[PDB]
């Protein structure tokens, strides 16, 4: 069961690499959220001190 | 004087016209004289011991390097790709050994490959398989002269 | 079974491979021990400098160079070699027992280097005492005619 | 041997590749979590500098 | 969290993680832990509780000292368990450490036990080991924690595999995911030792009065590059090193005395006369009679220096 299994192997490896590619894309989204939310704190944390 | 001497043969010797400075020259030469002779005997034992030690093993090392070299070229006779972890090679197996060498691959799995034949299914091509002949380990010259 | 093949002619079956690379070199012993086979390489249209193994063999070959360098000096002075003792037993008949070996070759490369330093320093820093000493005693002898 | 080992070979190799896929999809995202945290902490320190 | 707090402290469970002659128990104890400690919540806390069973890992790897392909007692060994155990162990051990405090502590805790950890791949390796075997030392040197520039010194000093550590690099491996960091290792590992300020450190250790081979000095091309600055210094504390040289008991100090005398090989003869302040040839001669091979090898070089230099 390998004559028609070459396409199956190609697809399986492609999936195995693309799932990890999407995992790293999720990593990059996580980092983008990290930065865009660490830079957005001025909305609340900064206005805490003027209230003080 | 000195030019002709050296061009032919000469070694400069700052000397003294009396025997007083003779003592000074004796002292200065004896300075190095006292130790000169060490050089040889010192140099001896190191090379002696090192060559003795290494000789017993350099030949083995050469055998090694040769063997791993050969297998590296054998590997070099194969193909690699990055995206797909697949290795490619082809070798022609005796017609009668159609199954025994698979059992032999059995000798490279139990602990050396995860139930690894790594392939047992074959697609065949019309390429003319080679033939062979053997001399039956008793008539080497006969068959050799026959086939040459 | 056994086929004469000398009153006939033989045929060796080809085999398709899709071996994953993950067993690339550790599996070398697989066929290094009793491979007893031939290959039809597929690596074509690309040459040594264009392929991969060229790179490591460029570091390897140096070790053979320095080894044959040593051999001359080794035979130089007074001594012989025991020859490969392994050759008598290690290459013992046809065995599946060929002891495993992985990276140890690189350790051998570095060690043969460390050695080659030893050798160069020794040879080039011992090959001089001769002449300067000789002239020194020559002048010493010249001293004797000072009376 | 008999031609029946293919089921072991192909399926187990795909199992290895998939296994590695999960290991490293989770691993790279964990590294993402730690980097997220440290970079967010640095940005928070900068905001604290502004507040000071 | 409280659930695992109960689940941690036990009495027999420690035995389930202690059966090392038989490896069935710790195997699961730690595979399930791997699937467990992924989340930092449990990761950190459980690390706060198990700081005595590292020996588990230690045996799980130290066994490989003596090994053979077709030996020992295992059936279906590592299709999924034999060294899948080692895979677990290593992956967990590194995995958990990513809190900077963790490695920051463990390194000082068990420097040596993870010193030979380098040996993990010195001889033998298989598929999945590659990415990980040294990917912790990766973290042991990363520029994000204390002592990230302080201890690896001794790692190198006692290892010295660095040339062969490079020798591991060239032999191409199928995977992309490991070439970057392995290269990173050596590059960073070179940009400090070659930068290990020579005379600064040299004079420091000299005035210390306690010394080791300190092989940096012998590696000297860049050190001789400014040996003229030593002539400036005139190394009168080396006149003191003479006093050190008459009486010695440390092999390192005793032999490095000869080495220090000998580096003149790449240094101009303008040092020859300041040497001529020295020159009693029976001194290094009687020392030559000190034939202890471990020092004698370079004692040959020392006693030899004078005359070939005369050639020089």
Swiss-Prot record, chain B:
Glycosylated. Disulfide bonds: none annotated. It is found in: Vacuole membrane. Present with 55714 molecules/cell in log phase SD medium. V-ATPase is a heteromultimeric enzyme composed of a peripheral catalytic V1 complex (components A to H) attached to an integral membrane V0 proton pore complex (components: a, c, c', c'', d, e, f and VOA1). Belongs to the V-ATPase 116 kDa subunit family. Subunit of the V0 complex of vacuolar(H+)-ATPase (V-ATPase), a multisubunit enzyme composed of a peripheral complex (V1) that hydrolyzes ATP and a membrane integral complex (V0) that translocates protons. V-ATPase is responsible for acidifying and maintaining the pH of intracellular compartments. Is present only in vacuolar V-ATPase complexes; enzymes containing this subunit have a 4-fold higher ratio of proton transport to ATP hydrolysis than complexes containing the Golgi/endosomal isoform and undergo reversible dissociation of V1 and V0 in response to glucose depletion. This is V-type proton ATPase subunit a, vacuolar isoform. The lineage of its organism: Eukaryota, Fungi, Dikarya, Ascomycota, Saccharomycotina. The gene is VPH1.
Curated annotation (Swiss-Prot), chain D:
Residues 8-38 form a coiled coil. Residues 12-31 are annotated as: Interaction with VMA10. It is found in: Vacuole membrane. It comes from the Eukaryota. Residues 1-13 are annotated as: Interaction with VMA5. Subunit of the V1 complex of vacuolar(H+)-ATPase (V-ATPase), a multisubunit enzyme composed of a peripheral complex (V1) that hydrolyzes ATP and a membrane integral complex (V0) that translocates protons. V-ATPase is responsible for acidifying and maintaining the pH of intracellular compartments. Present with 16134 molecules/cell in log phase SD medium. Homodimer. V-ATPase is a heteromultimeric enzyme composed of a peripheral catalytic V1 complex (components A to H) attached to an integral membrane V0 proton pore complex (components: a, c, c', c'', d, e, f and VOA1). Interacts with VMA5; the interaction is direct. Interacts with VMA10; the interaction is direct. Interacts with RAV1 and RAV2 components of the RAVE complex, which are essential for the stability and assembly of V-ATPase. Belongs to the V-ATPase E subunit family. This is V-type proton ATPase subunit E. It comes from Saccharomyces cerevisiae (strain ATCC 204508 / S288c). The chain holds residues 8 to 59 of 233 of the full protein.
Curated annotation (Swiss-Prot), chain E:
The chain holds residues 158 to 359 of 478 of the full protein. It comes from Saccharomyces cerevisiae (strain ATCC 204508 / S288c). Subunit of the V1 complex of vacuolar(H+)-ATPase (V-ATPase), a multisubunit enzyme composed of a peripheral complex (V1) that hydrolyzes ATP and a membrane integral complex (V0) that translocates protons. V-ATPase is responsible for acidifying and maintaining the pH of intracellular compartments. This subunit is essential for activity, but not assembly, of the enzyme complex. This subunit is also required for silencing the ATPase activity of V-ATPase when V1 is detached from V0. Present with 22500 molecules/cell in log phase SD medium. Belongs to the V-ATPase H subunit family. It comes from the Eukaryota. The gene is VMA13. Disruption phenotype: Increases the ATPase activity of membrane-detached V-ATPase V1. Abolishes growth at pH 7.5 and in the presence of calcium chloride, abrogates growth at pH 5.0. V-ATPase is a heteromultimeric enzyme composed of a peripheral catalytic V1 complex (components A to H) attached to an integral membrane V0 proton pore complex (components: a, c, c', c'', d, e, f and VOA1). Interacts with YND1. This is V-type proton ATPase subunit H. It is found in: Vacuole membrane.
């Amino acid at each position: 069961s390998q004559k028609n299994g070459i396409a199956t192997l190609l697809q399986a490896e492609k999936e195995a690499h693309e799932i990890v590619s999407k995992a790293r894309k999720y990593r990059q989204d996580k980092l983008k959220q990290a930065k865009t939310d660490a830079a957005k704190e001025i909305d609340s944390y900064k206005i805490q001190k003027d209230k003080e | 004087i000195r030019k002709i001497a050296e061009s032919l043969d000469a070694n400069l010797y700052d000397v003294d016209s009396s025997n007083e400075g003779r003592s000074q020259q004796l002292a200065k030469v004896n300075k190095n004289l006292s130790d000169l002779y060490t050089v040889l005997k010192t140099t001896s034992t190191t090379l002696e011991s090192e060559l003795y030690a290494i000789a017993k093993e350099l030949d083995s090392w050469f055998q090694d390097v040769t063997r791993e070299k050969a297998i590296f070229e054998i590997l070099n006779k194969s193909n690699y790709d990055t995206n797909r972890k697949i290795l490619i090679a082809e070798g022609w197996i005796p017609r009668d050994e159609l199954a025994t060498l698979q059992a032999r691959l059995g000798e490279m799995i139990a602990r050396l490959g995860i139930d690894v034949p790594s392939i047992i299914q074959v697609l065949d091509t019309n390429h003319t398989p080679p033939t062979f002949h053997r001399t039956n380990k008793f008539t080497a010259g006969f068959q050799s002269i026959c086939d040459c | 079974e056994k086929e004469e093949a000398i009153f006939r002619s033989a045929e060796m079956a080809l085999v398709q491979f899709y071996i994953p690379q993950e067993i690339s070199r550790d599996s070398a012993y697989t066929l290094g021990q009793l491979g007893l086979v031939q290959f039809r390489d597929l690596n074509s249209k690309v040459r040594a400098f264009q392929r991969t193994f060229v790179n490591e063999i460029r570091r390897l070959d140096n070790v053979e160079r320095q080894y044959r360098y040593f051999y001359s000096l080794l035979k130089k002075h007074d001594i012989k070699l025991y020859e490969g003792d392994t050759d008598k037993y290690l290459d013992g008949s046809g065995e599946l027992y060929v002891p495993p070996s992985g990276s140890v070759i690189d350790d051998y490369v570095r060690n043969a280097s460390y050695l080659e330093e030893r050798l160069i320093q020794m040879e080039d820093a011992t090959d001089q005492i001769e002449v300067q000493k000789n002239d020194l005693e020559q002048y010493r002898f010249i001293l004797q005619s000072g009376d | 041997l008999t031609p029946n080992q293919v089921n072991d070979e192909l399926n187990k190799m795909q199992a290895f590749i998939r296994k590695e896929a999960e290991e490293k999809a989770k691993e790279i995202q964990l590294k993402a979590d730690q980097e997220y945290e440290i970079e967010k902490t640095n940005i928070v320190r900068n905001e604290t500098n502004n507040i000071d | 969290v409280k659930l695992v707090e109960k689940l941690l402290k036990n009495n027999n469970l420690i035995n389930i993680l202690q059966n090392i002659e038989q490896m069935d128990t710790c195997y699961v104890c730690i595979r399930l832990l791997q699937e467990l400690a992924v989340i930092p919540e449990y990761r950190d806390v459980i690390w706060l509780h198990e700081k005595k069973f590292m020996p588990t890992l230690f045996k799980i790897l130290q066994r490989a000292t003596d090994s053979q392909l077709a030996t020992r007692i295992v059936a279906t060994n590592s299709n999924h368990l034999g060294i899948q155990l080692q895979y677990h162990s290593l992956l967990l051990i590194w995995l958990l450490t990513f809190n900077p405090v963790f490695a920051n502590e463990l390194v000082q805790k068990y420097l040596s036990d993870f010193l030979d950890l380098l040996k993990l791949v010195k001889i033998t390796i298989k598929e999945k080991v590659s990415r990980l075997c040294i990917s912790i030392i990766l973290q042991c040197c990363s520029t994000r924690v204390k002592q990230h520039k302080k201890v690896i010194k001794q790692l190198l000093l006692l290892g010295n595999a660095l040339p062969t550590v490079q020798s591991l690099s060239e032999r191409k491996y199928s995977d992309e995911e490991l070439r970057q960091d392995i290269s990173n290792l050596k590059e960073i590992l070179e940009n400090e030792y070659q930068e290990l300020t020579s005379f600064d450190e040299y004079s420091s250790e000299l005035k210390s009065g306690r010394l080791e081979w300190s092989p940096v000095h012998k590696s000297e091309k860049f050190w001789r590059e400014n040996a003229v600055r030593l002539n400036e210094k005139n190394y009168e504390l080396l006149k003191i090193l003479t006093k050190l040289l008459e009486v010695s008991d440390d092999p390192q100090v005793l032999a490095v005395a000869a080495h220090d005398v000998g580096e003149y090989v790449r240094h101009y003869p303008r040092g020859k006369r300041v040497i001529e302040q020295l020159g009693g040839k029976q001194l290094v001669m009687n020392h030559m009679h000190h034939e202890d091979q471990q020092v004698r090898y370079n004692a040959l070089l020392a006693v030899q220096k004078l005359m070939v230099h005369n050639w020089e």
